[PDB]
Amino acid sequence: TLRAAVFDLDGVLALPAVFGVLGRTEEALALPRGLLNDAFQKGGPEGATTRLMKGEITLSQWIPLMEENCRKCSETAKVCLPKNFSIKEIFDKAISARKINRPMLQAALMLRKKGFTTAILTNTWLDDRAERDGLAQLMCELKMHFDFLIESCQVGMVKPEPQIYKFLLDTLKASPSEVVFLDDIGANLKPARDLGMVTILVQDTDTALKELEKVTGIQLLNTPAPLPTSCNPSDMSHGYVTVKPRVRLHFVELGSGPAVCLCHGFPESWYSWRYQIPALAQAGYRVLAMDMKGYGESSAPPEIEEYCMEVLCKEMVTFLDKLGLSQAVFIGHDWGGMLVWYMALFYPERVRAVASLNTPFIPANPNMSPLESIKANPVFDYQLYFQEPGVAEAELEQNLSRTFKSLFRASDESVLSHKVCEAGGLFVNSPEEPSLSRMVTEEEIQFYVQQFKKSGFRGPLNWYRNMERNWKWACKSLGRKILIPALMVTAEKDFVLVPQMSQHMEDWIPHLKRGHIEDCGHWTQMDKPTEVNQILIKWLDSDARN
C-alpha cells in the first residue's frame, strides 16, 4: 500500500540533533536541566522560535531573542548564567557538528530506486549567519536525493500544526494511507497518525530502519554499498566555447573551487565521468567534464591534422583562455590521458596538476617511428586497421548499439575475438546482439548511441591517424621533465594499457604519485567508480588544493 516516505531532517537524516545541543550545553555548563530547552520554546505559537520556524524572522534576528528568553528562564530558576555564554557560539558549533546520517540516506535512496516518492519535511529557519554556507552545502547534498524538500520557514507553517501535514499530502499527491513519515519528536507524529499515515519514532537509526523495512517490505538495513551518485544529462549545466572559427568545445560543469578538467578517451564521452562528476564537486572542486574534439556536442571537423596532439593541446589552452581560467587540474583516461601528459610537458603554467588513468607516459623514441613499432608488435594491429580513413568508420557506425555493447564490458565479459587487419575488422566473429554488461544499463548505452549519431567515428578515429606528426612534436620535449604534481593510476585487468608499461615513469616524473586498482578493466570509471573517486579525491586534496 505504501507509496511515499517522508524523513525529518534534524535527528533523522542529520546527526547529532542540533535541537539536542541544548541538553548537552546545560550539562557542560552546570545549568538547571531543561533551562535552555524552556528558553527555546518560551511562548509556544506566539513565541520567537515559532516566528523563526515560520519564516517571519531570520536566525540572526532570533539569536538576541533566545538570549533574552534564556535570561528570563534563569531568573525564575534563581540561577545566574556564565559570562561567555553565547547562543550564536552554541548554535554555530552545533550546526557545523551536524553531519549526514548515511545509513538513513541510503534507505531513502533505496526506496526512491524501488519507485517511492521521497521527501524531506523539517522545521528550519532562514539562515543569515556569517557561517550560513556550511548548512547551505549540507542541504544541497541532501536535496538532490529527494523528490521534494518542504522547509517550514519557506511555507509559513510548522510541525505539528496539521496544515503542514495537509500541505505535504497535496505535494505528494497521495492519500495518508500510502505515506510513511519518520521523525525524532513524537509530538510531530500524532497529527500524521491522526490522518492515518504510517509513523515511525526515530530514536536509533537501526531500529527505525527495521520498522521501515517491515512496513515497506523492502530490505534497507545492511544492504550492499550503493554505487556513487551518477549524472542525469538533462540535469547538468552544459557549456559551449568556440576555440576556433569552426571548432566549438562542449563541456559539462558542476561544483565550485579549483577547476578540474576531465578528458575521456576512445570512444567515449563526458558521460564516462558520470560517477566522478558529483563526487569531485562534492569534494570541493569545479568539475569541467569535456566532450573531446570529435565527440558528442563538440565540433568534429573531418581533416585528420585537426586531431594531432599539438592542435588538440593548443585548443585546450584556448579553452582555458576563453573561460578565464589561468590554470586547471587535468585528469585524462585512455587517449585523454595521453593528452594531459603532453599538456603538462608543453603548458606547465596552465596545469595545476595532472593525473592519468591507465595511460602511462612513454617518451618518444627519437630512432624508431611509431608506424614501425605498431608493425613490429602485431599486438597493435587494430591501430593499423584504424589508419585507412573510412574503413573502421563503416564497421563501428554500422550498428552503434552493438558497437558499445561489445566494447563497454568488464575484463571477465570480453565478447570480441585475434589479429584485426587480416580478419576483416573488429567484429568478425562477434555477437551481433551482445548481452548487456554488468557495468552499464541499456539506458546508459543508448546515451552513447545518441551522442555518436551526431558525427560518427571520423573525428574519434582521426585521433589515431597522426602517429608521425605527434612523434615529431613529442621529440621536442625529450629534454624536459614533468615536475608539477602528477598522479598515475593503473588497472590490473587492463589488457590494452597494462600496468607494467608505467614502471619507468619515475625517470621522467620524479615526484610522481601512484594509485592502483585491483580487478579493474580498461573502462576504469564505470568499472570501479568508488575506488577511482577515493584515489582522485585523496590526491586532489593533497596535491592540487595546496
Ligand SMILES: CC1(C)[C@@H](O[C@H]2O[C@H](CO)[C@@H](O)[C@H](O)[C@@H]2O)CC[C@]2(C)[C@H]3C(=O)C=C4[C@H]5C[C@@](C)(CNC(=O)NCC6CCOCC6)CC[C@]5(C)CC[C@@]4(C)[C@]3(C)CC[C@@H]12
Ligand atoms: C590481443 C588482445 C586480446 C590483448 O592480448 C592479450 O589478451 C589477453 C590478456 O589477458 C591474453 O589472452 C592474450 O594472450 C594477450 O595477453 C592485447 C590488447 C588487444 C589487442 C586490444 C587492444 O589493444 C585494444 C582494444 C580496444 C581499445 C580501445 C579501448 C581504445 N583504447 C586505446 O586504443 N588505448 C591505447 C591508446 C590510448 C593512449 O594513447 C595511445 C594509445 C577501443 C576499443 C578496442 C579497439 C576494442 C578491442 C581491444 C580491447 C583489443 C584490440 C582486443 C584484442 C586485445
Ligand SMILES: [Mg+2]
Ligand atoms: Mg528533529
